[PDB]
């Protein structure tokens, strides 16, 4: 009453990306990575971290760390050296400024003035401070000063489901509100040199980018003045069965630390088909239309790794192009944890209209975009895409 | 429509609190401090770390960290030792446990099973770690697997406010749905020995203590069966003018610094008439009832520091038992960052039932809930009492 709600389901209006200019490719990376830390006696540590690289399904990543910064700063070359200061002082700056470049391409297409943003969520897994990432960017951005701001910090490869579960309640329930979120990550908070007692570690070396992705999300879009490029329909939450201590990160004096387990791939694959059934239950109940099948929709799956992305499409019984958006993104950015699976969002509505496809949902018209990370935590959002011309 | 949403507002349907069993009075605490610091000696420093206790308004306070843990641990017995590690191996648990009491009893008040809390929000300043403090206190209470989680780190004093920023929306538009709303702060993330180099630090020495509370919100209230205590009609968050700095708090190798200008309350203070007039004007429109006098809405107030309550007190023209309650908890349990305004709620239900006034809120229909913090952040919250008996 005292705030009316909305009507209409949140909608995407669009989507902006950014990547820092530097890019490495993975053929060169090994020797890259290897060189700068000093490593490149440990032969044997570097042909296992060759064939990771060589099965990683990753061709290049944009790095803001170069090589000019790394040996300006012999700390971070190092495997277990105290950097946290260092690297803060780093992301707490270059975060926000990542996310406003993919901020401002997502204000740019909606076409309306940046002081209709009402709402802003800032999701990072890289860095934290006070005033957060979020006032950084609205900052930045010149968004009004009363913009109703949420930083979700320390979040992980789960956020890009996260911000969405959230932004919908914040559209739905607020007429008018228009959200930016935000997505924004950088492997400087993480990047250590490699030791042969945490192997794990040498996998987030192969397979993490940096990257900001950004949308305005909004219900009720005004007729041919705003466009829906999704509607977000069904949101869950689970934390699978065994999972304690899959994926953990911690936050120490040598920066952010990973661990991962290597039967992440068979907790998500053996877990996500129970998980899909009962949320198309609930998007499509009998009392009535039977759910689309599998590979009847459209598909934004973070690729935590080239594994899990083969083990889901193997138990699933997917049909080998339902994740070829998805594959796309990790080939040509790597994993950029919260932000990877609104690059996916992104490059699918793209290829539908380059394509000339009749939703942006690839031709489809229920789609799923799944998100995975710490503890083992799996957020499902069921999408509707919006049909093209 | 896929998902139903809420028809009434958003209901605060129990409160719990919880602090570490360990008191300190303040008349002891400048002995206290500067003794297990081995400051003695800097008599200078200690004098003016007396007068701004026998200032500060409060009377004792809660705290994990005890003479025994400070003895075992002496790096955060000085004033800038690596000590980040230890301080988060110490939060990253105390802060869920702490946090588990209070939704504990959150939960016997609300009578409810204990699987019926559909959505968490964790809220704290003290310490960050993936899977976080959310996870942790699902993992302690035994919540549903799917429950859908929300940590907000490195939120700061005006955290109490956010939660019921957000929580409004997602009991709204969720039918059914029934948050759980946790703030948890424990000083051992900041505490650390004397310098007069630092004598902003010194204030948070005299002022910050210990403490968690938590809350059952929900819309459409069970009748008979489940009980409103206030209601949540209108949020708005402020970026003050000006106040670039005021309050900042950086995590460091050290633990998290604390940075704070002497302005504050006059930014806070200058600035707050506004913001209530604007809000209220918002909650009470022409187009129809006036909204009521400051001195006939209840009042929920961040006890930021004495300096700010009587600064706005002044500036307001606020009777003198407004800030009653407020005060009251400041004195009790000093300034618990985020959670501080939620024992404030509580402290004020509890006498208002306890004297047999006419409402939850002192008796007056309308109330403010306000929030400060980095920013400096000014986060509003206008809340309807309930009627009593
Ligand atoms: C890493 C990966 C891309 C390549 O591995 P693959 O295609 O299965 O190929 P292999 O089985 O030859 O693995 C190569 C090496 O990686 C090692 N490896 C893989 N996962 C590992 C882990 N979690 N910890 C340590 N070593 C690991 C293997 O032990 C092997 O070492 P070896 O050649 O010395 O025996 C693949 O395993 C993968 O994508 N895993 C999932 C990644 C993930 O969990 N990311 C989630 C994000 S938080
Ligand atoms: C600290 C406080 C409780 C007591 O101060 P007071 O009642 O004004 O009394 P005084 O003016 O004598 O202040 C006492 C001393 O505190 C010092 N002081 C107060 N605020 C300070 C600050 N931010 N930084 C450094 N010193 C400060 C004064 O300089 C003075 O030192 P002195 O005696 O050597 O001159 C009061 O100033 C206050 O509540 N301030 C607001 C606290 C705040 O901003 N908290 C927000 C939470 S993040
Ligand atoms: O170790 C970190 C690094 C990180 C990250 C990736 C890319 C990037 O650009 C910035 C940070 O994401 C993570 C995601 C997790 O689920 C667990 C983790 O431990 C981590
Ligand atoms: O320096 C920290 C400490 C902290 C805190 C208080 C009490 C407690 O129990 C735990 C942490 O709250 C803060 C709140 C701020 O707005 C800014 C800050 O820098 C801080």
């Given at each position: 009453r005292?705030?009316?709600?909305?009507?209409?389901?949140?909608?995407?209006?669009?989507?902006?990306?950014?990547?820092?200019?530097?890019?490495?490719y993975?053929?060169d990376?090994?020797?890259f990575?290897?060189?700068?830390?000093?490593?490149?006696?440990?032969t044997?540590?570097?042909?296992?971290?060759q064939?990771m690289?060589?099965?990683?399904?990753v061709?290049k990543?944009?790095?803001?760390?170069?090589?000019?910064?790394?040996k300006?700063?012999?700390?971070?070359?190092?495997?277990?050296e105290?950097?946290?200061?260092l690297?803060?002082?780093?992301?707490?700056?270059?975060?926000?400024?990542?996310?406003?470049?993919?901020?401002?391409?997502?204000?740019?297409?909606?076409?309306?003035?940046?002081?209709?943003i009402t709402?802003?969520?800032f999701?990072?897994?890289?860095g934290v401070?006070?005033?957060?990432?979020?006032?950084?960017?609205?900052?930045?951005?010149?968004?009004?000063?009363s913009?109703?701001?949420?930083?979700?910090?320390?979040?992980?490869?789960?956020?890009?489901?996260?911000?969405?579960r959230?932004?919908?309640?914040?559209?739905?329930n607020?007429?008018?509100?228009?959200?930016?979120?935000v997505?924004?990550?950088?492997?400087?908070?993480?990047?250590?040199?490699?030791?042969?007692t945490?192997?794990?570690?040498?996998?987030?070396?192969?397979?993490?980018?940096?990257?900001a992705?950004?949308?305005?999300?909004?219900?009720?879009?005004?007729?041919?003045?705003?466009?829906?490029?999704?509607?977000?329909?069904?949101?869950?939450?689970?934390?699978?069965?065994?999972?304690?201590?899959?994926?953990d990160?911690?936050?120490?004096?040598?920066?952010?630390?990973?661990?991962?387990?290597?039967?992440?791939?068979?907790?998500i694959?053996?877990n996500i088909?129970?998980?899909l059934?009962?949320?198309?239950?609930?998007?499509?109940?009998?009392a009535?239309?039977?759910?689309?099948?599998?590979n009847?929709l459209?598909?934004?799956?973070?690729?935590?790794?080239?594994?899990?992305?083969?083990?889901?499409?193997?138990?699933?019984?997917?049909?080998?192009?339902?994740?070829?958006?998805?594959?796309?993104?990790?080939?040509?950015?790597?994993?950029?944890?919260?932000?990877?699976?609104?690059f996916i969002?992104?490059?699918?509505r793209?290829?539908?209209?380059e394509?000339?496809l009749?939703?942006?949902?690839?031709?489809?018209?229920?789609?799923?975009?799944?998100?995975?990370?710490?503890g083992?935590?799996c957020?499902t959002?069921?999408l509707?895409?919006?049909?093209?011309?």
């Amino acid at each position: 009453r005292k705030m009316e709600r909305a009507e209409g389901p949140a909608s995407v209006l669009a989507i902006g990306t950014a990547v820092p200019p530097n890019v490495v490719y993975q053929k060169d990376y090994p020797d890259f990575y290897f060189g700068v830390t000093n490593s490149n006696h440990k032969t044997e540590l570097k042909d296992k971290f060759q064939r990771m690289c060589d099965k990683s399904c990753v061709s290049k990543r944009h790095l803001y760390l170069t090589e000019e910064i790394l040996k300006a700063n012999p700390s971070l070359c190092a495997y277990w050296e105290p950097s946290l200061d260092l690297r803060q002082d780093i992301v707490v700056v270059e975060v926000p400024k990542l996310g406003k470049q993919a901020a401002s391409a997502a204000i740019k297409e909606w076409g309306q003035p940046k002081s209709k943003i009402t709402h802003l969520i800032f999701c990072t897994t890289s860095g934290v401070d006070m005033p957060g990432a979020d006032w950084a960017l609205a900052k930045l951005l010149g968004l009004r000063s009363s913009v109703k701001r949420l930083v979700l910090y320390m979040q992980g490869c789960y956020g890009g489901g996260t911000v969405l579960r959230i932004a919908k309640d914040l559209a739905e329930n607020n007429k008018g509100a228009r959200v930016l979120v935000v997505c924004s990550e950088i492997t400087a908070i993480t990047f250590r040199g490699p030791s042969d007692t945490h192997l794990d570690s040498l996998v987030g070396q192969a397979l993490f980018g940096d990257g900001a992705s950004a949308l305005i999300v909004g219900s009720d879009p005004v007729p041919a003045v705003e466009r829906a490029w999704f509607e977000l329909h069904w949101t869950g939450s689970d934390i699978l069965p065994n999972s304690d201590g899959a994926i953990d990160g911690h936050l120490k004096e040598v920066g952010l630390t990973f661990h991962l387990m290597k039967d992440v791939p068979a907790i998500i694959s053996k877990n996500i088909g129970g998980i899909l059934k009962d949320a198309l239950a609930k998007v499509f109940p009998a009392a009535a239309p039977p759910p689309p099948t599998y590979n009847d929709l459209f598909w934004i799956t973070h690729p935590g790794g080239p594994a899990i992305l083969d083990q889901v499409e193997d138990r699933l019984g997917l049909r080998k192009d339902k994740l070829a958006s998805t594959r796309a993104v990790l080939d040509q950015f790597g994993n950029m944890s919260s932000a990877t699976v609104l690059f996916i969002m992104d490059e699918m509505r793209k290829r539908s209209v380059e394509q000339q496809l009749g939703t942006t949902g690839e031709g489809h018209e229920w789609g799923l975009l799944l998100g995975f990370g710490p503890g083992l935590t799996c957020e499902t959002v069921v999408l509707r895409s919006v049909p093209l011309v």
